[PDB]
């Protein structure tokens, strides 16, 4: 994208630089926190910060900063390209858009799929993920990662 004009000083005519970097860090789960990621990016120990002030007003290096996940940021290109209403109407749930949902564990077909954000958890387990496999019986489940 840099060689092709999509990144760099004068991005496609309009004046907007946006140099983009990658920061592959060492392995600590707490650096995933919104305001501990900022500390880790600063080169310090990944300790969270108290809010207020929010990262939006004072964030990365005392400058403003908005920390966003990967899927949230992947959601935006389609919103802009197809329209706001189309994204508003994907399905009739109060959480507009699509979501990456999946079932993990000893199911017949583990993975993740993109679903209309109003799907029942049973519709993922047995229709998509296949269900418990060959002799196993369902006992419980966590919606989302470990920590729910």
């Amino acid at each position: 994208a840099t060689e092709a004009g999509l990144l760099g000083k004068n991005i496609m005519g309009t004046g907007f630089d946006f140099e983009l970097f990658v920061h592959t860090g060492a392995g600590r789960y707490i650096c995933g926190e919104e305001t501990a990621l900022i500390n880790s990016l600063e080169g310090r120990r990944a300790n969270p910060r108290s809010k207020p002030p929010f990262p939006a007003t004072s964030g990365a290096w005392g400058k403003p900063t908005c920390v966003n996940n990967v899927e949230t940021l992947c959601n935006v290109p389609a919103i802009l390209a197809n329209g706001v209403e189309w994204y508003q109407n994907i399905s009739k749930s109060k959480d507009a858009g699509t979501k990456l949902m999946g079932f993990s564990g000893r199911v017949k077909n583990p993975g993740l799929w993109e679903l209309p954000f109003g799907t029942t958890a049973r519709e993922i387990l047995e229709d998509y993920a296949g269900g418990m496999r060959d002799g196993l019986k369902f006992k419980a489940w966590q919606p989302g990662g470990a920590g729910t």
Binding site: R28, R45, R49, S50, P52, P53, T57, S58, W61, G62
Partner: protein, 907 residues
């Protein structure tokens, strides 16, 4: 500004957190990680209080007191059952990993964790599993390290790194295995690392100097005294037990050294426990020594002095306002000679003149943390007076606080204030002969001789006012720096200028005076601080005498046939050859001193004076603040044959025996009245502390904790019939517990901080009106002078450029915190810490000779031929040599002098 705590309605400052406000109101909330000087971080989670709203929310939410803004419509409840249970469980979690060693902990009855564990009402262990353990480090010869007792409150790291800028202490590990110490064994480099012994709530960092001869806090006997190792009046509270100074603790003073000391003052006290200190007045009958009584000594001294053609006295700049005066009265005003060199005094009375007659406000030690720009012109502030260096370090962080207050960030949220700053500091321009310890924070350091530093200062003062004298020949590369300093000072709303006497130059002092006058003429409320050499240096300058050179001239001439040297060693203020040649040809040499100096070996009489620990008087610090120190213990107790009376007591009784023929041991208040009657400049020392007969509801103030132990057995080996407690007719304190020491007592001289439930240093919260504020009922000090209406003129004398002379080496003063003080260096603890003697050399001038990095070198300054190793100094200007000032063998008077011949060691 109107909060509701448990139904009650109080009025608070709405600009500070709820922990600060509730502690200022007198309520009791446990807290480990908050410190009224290091802001608030919500780490420990131990100051939880329930917070409601609507005044009718019956189900609040737990929130940390130290992190909530304490605004107007605030409804909290410290005593809520859920809040109580959480606070208790929070200490239980800390107790899960604690080591079963209170009995062997260095701080029992002084530990904050014990206080909070008994406060949260937790006295039952449900934990069953193993505890985590840690290996210790060797942090130096000062403070110990027991990481088993760490509760991870982060106070040490926050103080040491974010406050004092340490750079060699941090936190390591994570996940309940966290660790706080050095990256590797070694001594802690920071000058202000001693404060870790009281900043840390647990017994992780505890000083070794007290750990060797240990005694629990209750057993100690305190008294309000002043640190004597520096020109600042840092208020300490030394503790005594079994007749020897055990430790020196900090004594809050919201105007001088609120919470922190040096290491030179906290650990350099070991010179009072020396076993060679004079303990009885002895006489040298030819070759033999005979111990005298008190009355015998006074009668003999008076009989010999009354037959003298003239008696002169040599007071020191480390005595007290009375001791010097008392002496002045004994010898006549005329015969009193200040025991400092002529040049040591000229630039002391000039600094005093700049402070008094120069219409510029000289800030206190805590008001230094409120100035925008700082210009440390000619002083190694970190090594001479180091608390001023910490204050400057606090002043340079002011821009982060401004950036945070412009974004509506509270002044107690220190993490956000630091994050918003991001290494943005107020301008600070240090200036010295070589590198300093304030270079990491300085915007620019000038490394040059003490003449080029004065030229720089004069150039700044001319660029600011255009009427000050021009330097006439600075070269354009330095002009571009002088220009930055000017642009940064004239733009600052509150600039500070910190010169001093240690630089060894009059031109530096008058250049700083010129800079400060130009700024004041420009409009800014400029302050000016001058660092002197020794405590009570300012008092000697205010009182004044001839000099040491004039005293020696009278001595080696047959004009003066007697001399009384008071608390002076005379070898670090003049040449040790001339001093001995003068004292040799004197038919009487009295030495009133409390140490065993070299001049008392040819002394016809050695009165055993008392140290700061067991003496009463007042010493005036660098801003002219006359503070009074009090006697800690009675030297006679435990040793009946020990006449170690105070210096002013010896001299007053000698003057009485001189005229009267009868001894008169006066009282401290009579001496203070005599001073304020004869020397109008010191009329402010009468108000420095209430005299005797000052009582608090009939009771007099106490020197010992209420539960002081071992009262009928600590003197039983000497005699089983316990003696009467010593009588203190000098001051308002009693050498016993039958006295008063309460937080709400109406006095400002606190021997120690203890409040029921708060055994540790955190008991200082109960003694101040608002925590972190001034001591309730004021702070114990009286400035002698207030800023004048009209200032001095511009000093129209610019020194010529320093051009090195061939075959002569100008001596550049290098001051060390450990070993550069006459008395601290004598402590057997500083022998490990002080550096080895050396002579710094510029590489261009070390290679000019054959000497390389470690080769010994011999040089002659006077009769003496010293031989020191050689260290290469890249920052030192060419035609100079460095020498450790004050360190034994090198008198601080060797600052600006030039040694005439330097060559290899000639082995």
């Amino acid at each position: 500004a109107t909060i509701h705590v448990d139904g009650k309605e109080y009025e608070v400052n709405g600009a500070d957190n709820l922990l600060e406000a509730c502690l200022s109101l007198g309520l009791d909330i446990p807290y480990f990680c908050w410190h009224p000087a290091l802001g608030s971080v919500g780490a420990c989670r131990q100051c939880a209080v329930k917070q409601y709203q609507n005044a009718e929310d019956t189900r609040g939410r737990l929130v940390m007191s130290c992190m909530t803004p304490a605004s107007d419509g605030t409804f909290i409840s410290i005593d809520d059952e859920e809040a109580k249970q959480f606070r208790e469980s929070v200490v239980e979690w800390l107790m899960t990993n604690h080591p079963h060693d209170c009995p062997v902990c260095e701080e029992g009855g002084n530990c904050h964790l014990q206080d909070m564990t008994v406060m949260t009402g937790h006295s039952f262990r449900r934990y069953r599993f193993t505890k985590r353990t840690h290996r210790n480090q060797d942090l130096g010869p000062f403070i110990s390290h027991e990481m088993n007792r760490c509760i991870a409150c982060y106070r040490c790291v926050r103080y040491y790194k974010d406050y004092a800028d340490g750079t060699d202490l941090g936190v390591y590990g994570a996940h309940d295995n966290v660790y706080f110490g050095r990256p590797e064994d070694g001594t802690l480099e920071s000058e202000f690392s001693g404060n870790l012994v009281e900043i840390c709530p647990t017994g992780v960092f505890t000083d070794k100097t007290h750990s060797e001869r240990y005694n629990r806090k209750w057993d100690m006997q305190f008294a309000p005294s002043i640190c004597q190792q520096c020109s600042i009046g840092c208020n300490i509270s030394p503790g005594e037990r079994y007749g020897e100074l055990r430790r020196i603790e900090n004594r809050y003073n919201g105007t001088v050294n609120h919470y922190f000391l040096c290491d030179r003052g906290r650990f350099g006290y070991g010179y009072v426990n020396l076993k060679d200190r004079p303990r009885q007045p002895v006489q040298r009958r030819g070759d033999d020594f005979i111990t005298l009584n008190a009355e015998q000594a006074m009668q003999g001294a008076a009989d010999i002095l009354r037959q003298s053609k003239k008696v002169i006295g040599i007071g020191s700049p480390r005595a007290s306002v009375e001791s010097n005066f008392a002496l002045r009265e004994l010898v006549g005003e005329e015969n009193f000679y200040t025991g400092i060199a002529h040049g040591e005094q000229e630039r002391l009375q000039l600094a005093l003149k700049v402070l008094r007659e120069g219409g510029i406000y000289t800030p206190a030690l805590r008001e230094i943390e409120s100035y925008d720009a700082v210009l440390v012109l000619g002083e190694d502030v970190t090594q001479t007076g180091a608390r001023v260096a910490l204050a400057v370090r606090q002043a340079v962080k002011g821009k982060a606080r401004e950036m945070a207050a412009a974004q509506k960030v509270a002044d107690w949220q220190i993490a956000a204030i630091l994050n918003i700053g991001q290494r943005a500091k107020h301008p600070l321009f240090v200036t010295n002969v070589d590198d300093t310890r304030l270079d990491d924070i300085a915007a620019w350091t000038y490394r040059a001789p003490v003449e080029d530093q004065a030229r720089l200062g004069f150039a700044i003062a001319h660029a600011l006012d255009n009427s000050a004298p021009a330097v006439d020949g600075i070269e354009p590369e330095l002009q571009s720096k002088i220009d930055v300093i000017v642009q940064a000072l004239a733009g600052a709303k509150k600039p500070l200028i910190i010169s001093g006497t240690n630089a060894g130059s009059l031109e530096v002092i008058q250049a700083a005076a010129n800079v400060a006058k130009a700024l004041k003429g420009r409009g800014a409320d400029v302050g000016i601080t001058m660092i002197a050499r020794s405590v009570n240096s300012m008092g000697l300058g205010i009182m004044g005498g001839g000099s040491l050179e004039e005293a020696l001239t009278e001595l080696e001439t047959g004009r003066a046939d007697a001399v009384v040297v008071l608390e002076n060693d005379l070898h670090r203020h003049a040449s040790a050859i001339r001093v001995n040649a003068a004292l040799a040809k004197a038919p009487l040499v009295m030495v009133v001193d409390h140490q065993r100096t070299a001049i008392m070996e040819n002394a016809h009489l050695v009165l055993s004076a008392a140290s700061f620990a067991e003496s009463d008087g007042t010493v005036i610090n660098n801003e002219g603040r006359a503070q009074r120190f009090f006697q800690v213990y009675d030297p006679a107790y435990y040793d009946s044959k020990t006449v170690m009376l105070e210096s002013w007591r010896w001299l007053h009784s000698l003057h009485s025996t001189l005229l009267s023929r009868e001894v008169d041991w006066t009282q401290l208040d009579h001496v203070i009245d005599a001073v304020v009657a004869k020397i109008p400049e010191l009329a402010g020392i009468k108000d420095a502390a209430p005299d005797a007969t000052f009582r608090i509801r009939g009771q007099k103030l106490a020197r010992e904790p209420h539960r002081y132990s071992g009262r009928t057995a600590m003197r039983a080996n000497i005699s089983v019939h316990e003696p009467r407690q010593p009588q203190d007719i000098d001051t308002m304190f009693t050498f016993s517990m039958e006295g008063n020491n309460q937080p709400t007592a109406h006095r400002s001289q606190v021997p120690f901080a203890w409040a029921p439930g708060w055994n540790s240093p955190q008991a200082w919260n109960k003694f101040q009106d608002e925590v972190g504020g001034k001591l309730r009922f004021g702070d114990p000090g009286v400035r002698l002078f207030e800023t004048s209406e009209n200032g001095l003129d511009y000093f129209t004398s610019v020194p010529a450029r320093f051009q090195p002379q061939d075959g002569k080496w100008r001596i550049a003063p290098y001051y060390h915190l450990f070993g550069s003080d006459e008395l601290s260096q004598r402590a057997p603890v500083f022998q490990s810490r002080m550096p080895q003697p050396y002579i710094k050399l510029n590489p261009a001038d070390a290679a000019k000779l054959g000497v390389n990095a470690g080769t010994r070198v011999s040089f002659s300054y006077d009769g003496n031929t010293v031989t020191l190793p050689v260290e290469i100094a890249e920052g030192l200007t060419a035609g100079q040599v460095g020498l450790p000032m004050g360190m034994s063998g090198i008198a601080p008077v060797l600052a600006g002098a030039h040694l005439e011949d330097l060559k290899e060691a000639q082995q």
